[PDB]
Design an enzyme around this catalytic site. Sequence first.
Site, short mmCIF file in Angstrom:
data_model
loop_
_atom_site.label_atom_id
_atom_site.label_comp_id
_atom_site.label_asym_id
_atom_site.label_seq_id
_atom_site.Cartn_x
_atom_site.Cartn_y
_atom_site.Cartn_z
N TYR A 71 0.93 -1.17 0.06
CA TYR A 71 -0.07 -0.25 0.05
C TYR A 71 0.64 1.19 0.04
CZ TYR A 71 -3.54 -3.37 0.50
OH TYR A 71 -4.61 -4.48 0.61
N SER A 72 0.45 2.07 -0.86
CA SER A 72 1.37 3.29 -0.98
C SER A 72 1.26 4.27 0.20
CB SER A 72 0.93 4.26 -2.24
OG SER A 72 0.96 3.31 -3.31
N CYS A 250 -0.02 7.17 -10.79
CA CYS A 250 -0.11 5.98 -10.01
C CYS A 250 -1.61 5.81 -10.00
CB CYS A 250 0.23 6.74 -8.60
SG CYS A 250 0.35 5.66 -7.17
N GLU A 290 3.93 4.13 -10.87
CA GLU A 290 3.65 2.77 -10.00
C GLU A 290 2.11 2.42 -10.15
OE1 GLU A 290 5.98 2.25 -6.73
OE2 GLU A 290 5.07 0.43 -7.39
N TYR A 292 -0.70 -0.67 -10.24
CA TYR A 292 -0.97 -1.83 -9.79
C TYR A 292 -2.31 -2.46 -9.86
CZ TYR A 292 -2.31 1.73 -6.57
OH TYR A 292 -3.02 2.91 -5.95
C1 LIG Z 1 3.42 -0.78 -4.96
C2 LIG Z 1 1.75 -0.82 -5.04
C3 LIG Z 1 1.24 0.03 -4.20
C4 LIG Z 1 -0.15 -0.25 -3.98
N1 LIG Z 1 -0.95 0.82 -3.46
C5 LIG Z 1 -2.27 0.74 -3.05
C6 LIG Z 1 -3.02 1.63 -2.60
O1 LIG Z 1 -2.49 2.52 -2.00
N2 LIG Z 1 -4.39 1.40 -2.25
C7 LIG Z 1 -4.93 0.01 -2.66
O2 LIG Z 1 -6.00 0.11 -2.11
N3 LIG Z 1 -4.10 -0.66 -3.06
C8 LIG Z 1 -2.74 -0.55 -3.25
N4 LIG Z 1 -2.21 -1.68 -3.92
C9 LIG Z 1 -2.72 -2.95 -4.28
C10 LIG Z 1 -2.56 -3.87 -3.19
O3 LIG Z 1 -1.11 -4.10 -2.93
C11 LIG Z 1 -3.43 -5.10 -3.19
O4 LIG Z 1 -3.22 -5.71 -4.29
C12 LIG Z 1 -5.00 -4.95 -3.25
O5 LIG Z 1 -5.44 -4.07 -2.22
C13 LIG Z 1 -5.79 -6.14 -3.29
O6 LIG Z 1 -5.33 -7.11 -2.44
P1 LIG Z 1 -6.42 -8.10 -1.65
O7 LIG Z 1 -5.74 -8.85 -0.45
O8 LIG Z 1 -7.57 -7.28 -1.07
O9 LIG Z 1 -6.99 -8.81 -2.67
P2 LIG Z 1 -6.85 -10.32 -3.09
O10 LIG Z 1 -7.48 -11.48 -1.84
O11 LIG Z 1 -5.19 -10.52 -3.14
O12 LIG Z 1 -7.39 -10.69 -4.38
C14 LIG Z 1 -6.66 -10.12 -5.63
C15 LIG Z 1 -6.59 -11.09 -6.63
O13 LIG Z 1 -7.58 -12.00 -6.94
C16 LIG Z 1 -7.89 -12.17 -8.24
N5 LIG Z 1 -8.62 -10.92 -8.77
C17 LIG Z 1 -8.43 -9.60 -8.74
N6 LIG Z 1 -9.62 -9.06 -9.44
C18 LIG Z 1 -10.05 -9.71 -9.85
C19 LIG Z 1 -11.31 -9.60 -11.05
N7 LIG Z 1 -11.67 -8.52 -11.30
N8 LIG Z 1 -11.71 -10.82 -11.19
C20 LIG Z 1 -11.23 -12.15 -11.18
N9 LIG Z 1 -10.15 -12.22 -10.08
C21 LIG Z 1 -9.77 -11.08 -9.78
C22 LIG Z 1 -6.19 -11.75 -8.74
O14 LIG Z 1 -5.36 -12.82 -8.70
C23 LIG Z 1 -6.03 -10.73 -7.80
O15 LIG Z 1 -4.67 -10.50 -7.84
C24 LIG Z 1 -0.77 -1.39 -4.35
C25 LIG Z 1 0.11 -2.62 -4.70
C26 LIG Z 1 1.51 -2.15 -5.20
C27 LIG Z 1 2.22 -3.58 -5.95
#
Ligand SMILES: Cc1cc2nc3c(=O)[nH]c(=O)nc-3n(C[C@H](O)[C@H](O)[C@H](O)COP(=O)(O)OP(=O)(O)OC[C@H]3O[C@@H](n4cnc5c(N)ncnc54)[C@H](O)[C@@H]3O)c2cc1C
Length: 292
Positions: A71-72, A250, A290, A292
């Site tokens: 998370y940024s 971003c 950046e 994601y």
């Molecule tokens: C450097 C960087 C900065 C970030 N900054 C932020 C930020 O500031 N705020 C923020 O909210 N997030 C940010 N993220 C995103 C964050 O890291 C997570 O990926 C996001 O919050 C989702 O994670 P989760 O655990 O809730 O979802 P998860 O339980 O990980 O589910 C996500 C996964 O399920 C599957 N999936 C996702 N979408 C779909 C869909 N549309 N249909 C079917 N399958 C799908 C994919 O495999 C996906 O990767 C950032 C990521 C990076 C790498």
Amino acid sequence: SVPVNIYRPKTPFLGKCIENYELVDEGGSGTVRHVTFDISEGDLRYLEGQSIGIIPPGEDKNGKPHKLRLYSIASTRHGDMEDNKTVSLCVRQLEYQDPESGETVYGVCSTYLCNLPVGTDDVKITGPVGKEMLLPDDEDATVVMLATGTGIAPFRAFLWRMFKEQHEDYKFKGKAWLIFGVPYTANILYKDDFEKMAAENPDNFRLTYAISREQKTADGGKVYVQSRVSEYADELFEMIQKPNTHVYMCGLKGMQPPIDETFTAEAEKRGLNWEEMRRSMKKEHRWHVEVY
Ligand SMILES: Cc1cc2nc3c(=O)[nH]c(=O)nc-3n(C[C@H](O)[C@H](O)[C@H](O)COP(=O)(O)OP(=O)(O)OC[C@H]3O[C@@H](n4cnc5c(N)ncnc54)[C@H](O)[C@@H]3O)c2cc1C
């Protein structure tokens, strides 16, 4: 001088949630939350533009800890309380529907954070990461910031550093331009902050909105960040041709293709070569992404 990995995924810092509030106003879509943690018990230090990891609780099928999600960081190095004791995030809840069952699935970590009660301890946090989205040392830099959704987060940090804080060494004297894309006025994350900074720094800070369900293109279509880049392509290219100018982008991966294509198309229109410009910008470390 740039901190990284002060905490490793092996042994994360344990933080305490001290605030968690909704950023999308009534009538908006979705839920994005501003989540802050006390970190004063550890050595977590960070710079604006960096990220932290969160390890959501529980296990995966093999009795295994979940992977961290990044998370940024939405706060300046000092934190929102300006006492160097806290860190904040801007977290959107991820939802999707399974294409076979129809079931709704909520992202694990974003759900964990969005429902994280104030008072909650034991938050597993990992040491700061990233060098790509740092603010330039040049106090005279022109900073162009393209944002959709949670992509606003490092720019909130930038801007607070630029116009809302007084430092013992640094003082921004450049131009800053934020182009922020959201579907509805209600969805303008941190609207009041930005608008206050705009009113108080009328010649150094420019705030451009792209409100997709409320503003129309000349063709009648929805205005996106890429629509603003097109409308102001001449000005952006003039700015890009200064050596002191940095462009930052971003948000979710989906903002990139159409932005990269607007630049490309607007470049051809002007007999310029956008791959070129971008290459050199990347070599001059003036182009930062950046997504994601
Ligand atoms: C450097 C960087 C900065 C970030 N900054 C932020 C930020 O500031 N705020 C923020 O909210 N997030 C940010 N993220 C995103 C964050 O890291 C997570 O990926 C996001 O919050 C989702 O994670 P989760 O655990 O809730 O979802 P998860 O339980 O990980 O589910 C996500 C996964 O399920 C599957 N999936 C996702 N979408 C779909 C869909 N549309 N249909 C079917 N399958 C799908 C994919 O495999 C996906 O990767 C950032 C990521 C990076 C790498």
